[PDB]
Symmetry: C3
Subunit: 344 residues, 3 copies
Amino acid sequence: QSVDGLYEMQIPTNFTIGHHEEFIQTRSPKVTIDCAAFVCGDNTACRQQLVEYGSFCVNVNAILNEVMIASAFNNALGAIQDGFDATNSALGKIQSVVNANAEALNNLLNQLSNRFGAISASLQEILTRLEAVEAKAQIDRLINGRLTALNAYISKQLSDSTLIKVSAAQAIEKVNECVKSQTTRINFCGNGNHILSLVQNAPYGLYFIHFSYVPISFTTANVSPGLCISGDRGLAPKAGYFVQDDGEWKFTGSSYYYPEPITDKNSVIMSSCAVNYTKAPEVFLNTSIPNPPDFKEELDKWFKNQTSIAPDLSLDFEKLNVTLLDLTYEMNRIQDAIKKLNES
Amino acid sequence: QSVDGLYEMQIPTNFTIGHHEEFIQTRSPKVTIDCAAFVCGDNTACRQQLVEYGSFCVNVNAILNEVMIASAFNNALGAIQDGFDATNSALGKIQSVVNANAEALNNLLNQLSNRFGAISASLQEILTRLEAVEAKAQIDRLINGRLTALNAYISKQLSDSTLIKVSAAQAIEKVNECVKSQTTRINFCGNGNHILSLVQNAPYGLYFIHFSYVPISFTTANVSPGLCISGDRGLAPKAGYFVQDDGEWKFTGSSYYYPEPITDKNSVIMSSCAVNYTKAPEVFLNTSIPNPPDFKEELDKWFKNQTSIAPDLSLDFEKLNVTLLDLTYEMNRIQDAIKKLNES
Amino acid sequence: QSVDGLYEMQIPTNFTIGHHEEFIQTRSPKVTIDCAAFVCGDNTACRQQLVEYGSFCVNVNAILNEVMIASAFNNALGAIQDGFDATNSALGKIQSVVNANAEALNNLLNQLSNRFGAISASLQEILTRLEAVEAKAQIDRLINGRLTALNAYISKQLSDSTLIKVSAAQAIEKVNECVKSQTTRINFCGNGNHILSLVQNAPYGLYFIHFSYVPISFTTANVSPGLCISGDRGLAPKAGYFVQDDGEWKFTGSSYYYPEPITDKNSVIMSSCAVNYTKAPEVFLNTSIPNPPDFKEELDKWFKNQTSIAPDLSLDFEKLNVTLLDLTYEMNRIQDAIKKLNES
């Protein structure tokens, strides 16, 4: 009684002697990243800022590398003289005040000239200082772009370094079980069935020569996983397979064969013809990167909506009313009086 | 004479035929990171800045994917006329100068209005330009936060990719020594003692069926690592263990057994009963991240403590003294003279 | 006829019993990075900005952890009085206008004082706001430097974690084939030829004791990879080597030996004396990091060469001409007339 089924395998029938040359890398080229070269190159402007960025490459490289009428007349003269004197005094007052105010206006013009000058100078300072900040901000964004790429490359470089550490470990076992000894493995240490091997060095690792023989010809047999007698005792093959041959059972060694009748030295007497099926759980590395919470909503938690406006720098003409003197009219009256006094 | 001690193992006594189903992932899902989606999402504001950040995703994805008275009278008229004429001339001068200065003040008011207007406009330009810079700086900090997280995820993604490369290599050996051949290994290629196996593909790797039998029942024996005769010749077991049985020594095969008397084909004649104890050094990956030099102390090396102040834009009233004309007093004297001349 | 050549190996002649103690790390210490501590330390200033940087450590730690004359006289008085009256009126007009303009100038001085005051205050606001931005920019550059180092350390930490996952897998096989069973491997499970082993736990992994015997003495033989009869039938050795002995051929087992004559049970009859030489391709991980496109050329694609200038805040003196009143000359004429009227 065949156990279960799922029979069939290719069984060696004849062999060929041959070689298999192989190389395993066991050590990596050493690296140094000259961060500035990676980030920007030789544009002085980026250099100027990178030097303020902190000692960045210390960590990058440490990680990667270590890895009656007369009286009236005289009376009038008195009044006339006093009249003219009062005028004389008034003209005196006018000259003084008007000239004083004229000077005050001239002093104002000079002070204003300087105040405006100073404002102009200040505004240029602000514009230069502010524009410089804005321009640098454009540069900083490009630099951070480049540095985050640098980190992507550090990670790739380290990952490959780890893969080498693993590979090198494999090389050590291949030395221990292929050159320092003769193992009993199939399709390892070269191919086929191992005989002998050589190990020589190569620039970054080990170069192996494996001597072995390989199945070169083989046949097909409906090899059974096992057999139960028609009754209740099970039989497993030992280092071979149960092979049905014209309906009967013989078995073959798994490395080369003769359909030998199954004897009691070619099988294991089983505790039961029952088949115990088991199944390992599957672990699948379906990694994905989550999309972080909305940018705006996060930013708003601390973002400052700070605004301001310029002062209302505007003069109010309502309280500033400057006018003219229409004296000519009165002057004309004076002139007329002068002419009348040319007639009396 | 038992050698050393540290005896005891579980030895197979009976067997069961069964299966072990197994899956090995050999290839990863392909990924692309659409950096913008990761960093911020669809907030136009972040998009606006990210496009200025440089061609960031080129490197991110390339890495992850590729992986007488009358005379006196007339005399007086002369003087009176000249007196009035001099007044007339003076009033002329006054009208002209005062009006001229009045115009100068009006021109000043108009020029000042424009100068202040221009200052106001400039201040608004600065405030807009400056506030815009400050607001963007708040955004840049959030973006860099998000990009540094992106790099943490690239590294995790690459690390898992490396782990798959290692796993895939394991799959290849499990194919070469379990399906393409029958190996002689224990608790490998499935479980127990390998007989046969099948390999079929699955979406991301290989799915194996392993046929084998397993110890299902076993016993306990105080198996010795070795034995020395009571004298000086040592004996090591071959593919089995020395088992003491009612005080004498038999040995058992390690895969199943009969307590067979130790014969000269069940042991190795040793060069000495001496025991050579050795010990590998321990390599323990207790990695830690150093805490970098103090932030302030580093920053200060280049930090610029640059300050400035606004110009002292203040008018000095000391040199600007504007006053009034108290002419009324003299006018009153004139008026009195006029009245006196109404009496003479 | 020797096949090919490349003969020679060291063949076991005598053995020693001994131990090999070994430890394999199978699990890592757990880590948490307190990002702020790494980035800057306890400088409040960096703390102040890092809290605005976003929830950075959420991702860092989630990844790492989860892992007739009288009439003339009266006539003249009329004219004189009218003359003085006209003067009186004119002085009235002068007092009013000059005083009015004097007030307008004083109001201007007060409004200007306030306008300049406001400008000064505004300029201080801009300078503070602007300087604060410039200072923070210096800090942001240092922080990004430090964060990009943090990412270099995350990648190293993850890489080591992967290496442990690989190591742990090795430990499991070393348990399955060294302690739970007796394998047939050489220089594995300890050293030499495995007999027995023990496994005990240790703080981060497994501690093994392996019992085995090792070749302690061995000889040299010019072992051939194979032999062809002088005719056309090839012979490969089985689990041993063909050894030429005084010109004839014997073979030895590969684990210990007697130069046994080659019998028909010590070799494989080959299909051909031909030697099949093969060679695996070499895969060498010579990874390098490309130098990105020129910084300037990339930046210029979006860089804004935006400039501006301060308004030409300058008063034009050409239209502002302020002058003085030379009235004294006429006054002198008036004074002379007064004296003449003291004589008539």
